[PDB]
Amino acid sequence: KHSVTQYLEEIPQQVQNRLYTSPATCLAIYRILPPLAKFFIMAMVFNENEVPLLDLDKWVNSNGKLQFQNAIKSMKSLHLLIPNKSSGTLMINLNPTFKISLRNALTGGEVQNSFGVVVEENVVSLDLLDEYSANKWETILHFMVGTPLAKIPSEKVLNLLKHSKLMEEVNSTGEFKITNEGFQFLLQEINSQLWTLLLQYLKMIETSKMDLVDVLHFIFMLGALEVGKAYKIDALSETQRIMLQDMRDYGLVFQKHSNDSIFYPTKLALMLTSDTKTIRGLKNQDIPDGSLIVETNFKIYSYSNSPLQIAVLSLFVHLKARFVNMVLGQITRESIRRALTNGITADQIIAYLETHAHPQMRRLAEEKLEKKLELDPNCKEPLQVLPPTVVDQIRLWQLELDRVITYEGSLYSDFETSQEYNLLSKYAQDIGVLLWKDDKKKKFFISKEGNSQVLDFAKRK
């Protein structure tokens, strides 16, 4: 988890304070925080007198009071609060801007931005655009995955992917295929897919029109609700418009055509901070949408399917014979080499497959599990929960296929004594260069380019 929070906190306070104007964000980020934060924030939310510290520690009893640190670190980490060690104590209060940025929002303040959604005549249909972006939102996966349909045609979007370079494919030939990031691309479907990308916008977002609130606000304003109009008409900065253009271009925004309106709030924006139900021509029903068979017979077992996720699942198994709702494809010791041909371990595969395609394998989780949870100490010999038999073989083949590690560069060789190692190689294991730390080796390893602190101290020894 990249934990967008981590991206968030990267910036200094003035920028943080810059952003806290848009109230919904303050609320949005409020959701982000661990509960203690959420808790104590309220505790300070409506008392306009900075407060000591031990009191808060005196709020918590024993075990769990570590989260206090995990709490207080976080808030301090982004410095929402302002410490005051005036009287030796810590007099504390939020960034009042942010605090009022909340309170105003919390009790109907002057939030024109967070309340930028100017509702209008609702022309939105449920199936209306339900995949209308979902197509573009799905096709991009294929276009990213590399498939029959040019679902990844966004020149900016592609240039984003190329700029993002998270995909392991031949950009020289144009490919940005399943790298580990591509594998990760397969990994975090919605929360991962959205966020994992969204930063790419920021990743590309460095050149012109910083306007981060007008950027971020365009996000959480989207993250707010399907207000449709009242902003896309006017209530958005030009940075919003480009973001609006980008959002629709990213698909993540439910903006219709004609380039003059308030775009609808596509479901994605809900999914952006949902962590809830996420599924959604006219046939759109799950959970069986992802349909497949998991078992120790090394094959495709597919009645239902996601007509891309299949070829996605193929990315570790050879397609041999497509049929209407089934395909002959043998996922075997041979097939797994492909995920290693890309290189990524199919370890993500395990739980995901133990999580996905079970819609077609629901009788499986009882033909296999038998709920072998409480009978654990009554039998020395459990039964396939969760099915490891191929997974062991996988884990077997895992090393068995991998079975090597290579290094390259120069080779430092035949050192002198136990300082350069136990002065500056556990210190190379303390300044992050080494590509081998074998103490007695008297020889150590890096990657050729990586010496800026490697031909520097052993000379000094």
Binding site: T296, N297, Y303, L319, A321, F323, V324, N325, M326, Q393
Partner: protein, 638 residues
């Protein structure tokens, strides 16, 4: 030739290409939808009730029965050929597939299925009312008699005869196919090649060998004797040799040794004719005469068996016979009185012949029985049909494909055949032998494989584990040359080929019901004798390519021959797999059909506790490097 390959080829009909699926018919109709073009098997949302449906699935293909909604399936060409015994409404299966037209219904496959229902029951080879004739019976193989020349010109225009069913009886198509397009009475001369001509002219023709419909016999020296009983896997085989018209025979694949004489008793009892019986070796055969041959239905006196040293009463009784192929499957023959026996019985029109575990038997020697008896009917009994000698004519076009399989995970729900959880311990390797393994040559490389230090550390651990939780052991290995050294370096008995008969007795007597000297080793000819009714702790150590089949078959008699019916039966198998070595891939290729059978396998490269063994010689690796110096010797002999 005389026989046909078609008895060892399961897992077919897999009709599906890069665009197999037609407009999903069963998409709407979701009561049941097997993979049609394949013939695969899959349930449907309007229909999940499975368990009773075992039989209908039995008609077609291969399941996955640790599958959840259902198991797998497949098409099968000769599989419909087998189904002719019932011979039900052919379109009904298609009608059954009517709902199962999962894609747009694969009428071509359906036609293929109609074709898949073409041959069996559509047989064609004439027969006549106490004789044989030149005609044909069903549509699938009709002309397999009439238009013939060894069945049609080897069908003789003789009108009809039971009493007139003899002179000819173009040899006795007493076991002819389904009969009588205008049927020209069969002759006495030349079907020894017809059986070859058949598939040669490719007639999928359903042989028929009757119960009383050949009166070339005031029906001869058998009679019905039914005293026997039945465990849940008998009757199908028994009625499997009836069909239409008049009766028939065939070939059946089994883990043998289940009182298979008893099932042999019936059909022979049910023809009252001239029959002989055959088994491998006076090494093998005696596990037959007297613990599983008399609790059954036969009189105590008749039969004779022949080795001219292990000879019997020949020229004596009109009754039935029993012999060994390899006895006369060869110009091997001990007492020329063998040729006092040879000529008749060879030349004798036996109504039926019994061959047993002809599996290992090569055409290069198996054709002798083909060239020996030519009995009016035949018995198909071996171990495995998918093989290494998968050559052109398997005994099928002589008798037929396999008739009855075994059953393992869900019929044994009537009788547990020894619940298995197989083990392969993935012991790593040292280059020290391996380096000159990189210097080695022809199979004398494999000896180096036997020189692995890891086998020892595990070997006692197996003995320790088994007795730490206290159940005694049966082991498997090969290449006695040093494996014998292993034995009395394991503290355990040594067993070796090239061995006197005397010493074979001291192995079991104060050893079986005792509880102390509880370990055993095996040779490469001793396995051709017996396995204990004890110690299903089964540990493989050493094997060899190609033998894998019979090696895997060798493992068979332990568990399947067992029948005790408890609640769980916590039984297991174990094996040694020295990692980083030439064979395990072939062993995986051997493993390739391990859990094929549903009898499963689990792997442990290292368990919880392998190293707990302090009694291992070579505990430090310099004795293992002393071993190196001994490792040289034979491979320096090599």
């Amino acid at each position: 030739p005389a026989d046909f390959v078609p008895d060892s080829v399961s897992g077919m009909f897999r009709s599906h290409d890069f665009s197999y699926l037609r407009l999903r018919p069963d998409h709407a109709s979701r009561p049941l939808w097997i993979s049609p073009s394949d013939g695969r098997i899959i349930l449907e949302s309007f229909s999940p009730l499975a368990e009773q449906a075992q039989d209908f699935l039995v008609t077609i293909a291969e399941p996955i029965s640790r599958p959840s909604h259902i198991h797998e399936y497949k098409i099968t060409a000769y599989s419909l050929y087998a189904a002719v015994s019932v011979g039900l409404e052919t379109d009904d299966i298609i009608s059954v597939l009517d709902r199962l037209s999962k894609v747009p219904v694969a009428e071509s496959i359906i036609n293929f299925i109609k074709g898949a229902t073409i041959s069996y029951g559509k047989v064609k080879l004439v027969i006549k009312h106490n004789r044989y004739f030149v005609e044909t019976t069903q549509a699938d193989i009709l002309q397999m008699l009439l238009n013939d020349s060894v069945i049609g010109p080897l069908r003789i225009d003789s009108d009809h005869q039971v009493q007139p069913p003899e002179d000819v009886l173009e040899r006795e198509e007493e076991d002819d196919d389904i009969d009588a397009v205008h049927s020209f009475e069969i002759a006495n001369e030349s079907v020894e090649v017809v059986k070859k001509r058949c598939q040669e002219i490719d007639y999928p023709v359903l042989e028929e060998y009757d119960f009383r419909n050949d009166h070339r016999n005031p029906d001869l020296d058998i009679d019905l004797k039914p005293s026997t009983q039945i465990r849940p896997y008998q009757e199908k085989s028994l009625s499997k040799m009836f069909g239409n018209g008049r009766a028939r025979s065939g070939i059946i694949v089994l883990p043998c040794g289940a009182g298979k004489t008893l099932v042999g008793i019936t059909a022979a009892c049910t023809i009252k004719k001239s029959v002989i019986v055959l088994c491998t070796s006076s090494v093998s055969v005696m596990q037959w005469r007297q613990q599983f041959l008399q609790w059954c239905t036969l009189q105590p006196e008749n039969c004779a068996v022949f080795t001219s040293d292990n000879k019997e009463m020949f020229q004596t009784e009109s009754g039935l016979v029993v012999s060994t192929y390899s006895m006369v499957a060869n110009t091997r023959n001990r007492s020329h009185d063998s040729q006092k026996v040879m000529d008749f019985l060879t030349g004798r029109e036996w109504g039926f012949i019994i061959l047993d575990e002809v599996h290992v038997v090569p055409a290069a020697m198996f054709r002798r029985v083909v060239s020996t008896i030519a009995a009016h009917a035949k018995l198909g009994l071996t171990a495995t049909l998918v093989r290494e000698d998968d050559k052109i004519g398997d005994l099928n076009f002589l008798i037929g494909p396999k008739l009855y399989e075994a059953n393992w995970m869900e019929l044994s729900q009537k009788g547990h055949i020894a619940n298995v959880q197989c083990a392969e311990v993935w012991c790593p390797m040292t280059a020290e032998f391996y380096q000159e393994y990189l210097r080695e040559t022809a199979r004398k490389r494999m000896l180096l494989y036997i020189m692995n230090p890891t086998k020892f550390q595990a070997c006692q651990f197996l003995i320790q584990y088994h007795e730490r939780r206290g159940d005694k052991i049966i082991v498997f290995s090969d290449n006695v040359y040093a494996l014998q050294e292993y034995a009395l370096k394991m503290g355990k008995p040594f067993i070796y080929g090239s061995t006197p008969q005397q010493e074979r007795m001291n192995i079991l007597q104060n050893f079986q019901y005792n509880d102390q000297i509880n370990t055993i080793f095996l040779s490469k000819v001793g396995d051709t004798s017996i396995d204990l009714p004890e110690a299903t702790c089964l540990i493989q150590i050493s094997s060899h390519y190609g033998s894998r089949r019979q090696e895997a078959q060798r493992l068979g008699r332990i568990l399947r021959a067992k029948r005790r019916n408890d609640e769980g039966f916590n039984a297991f198998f174990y094996s040694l797999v020295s990692k980083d070595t030439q064979e395990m891939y072939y062993s995986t290729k051997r493993q390739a059909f391990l859990v094929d059978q549903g009898y499963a396998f689990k792997v442990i490269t290292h368990l919880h506790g392998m190293e707990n063994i302090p009694n291992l010689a070579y505990a430090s690796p310099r004795e293992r490097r002393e071993l190196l110096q001994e490792v040289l010797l034979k491979n320096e002999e090599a």
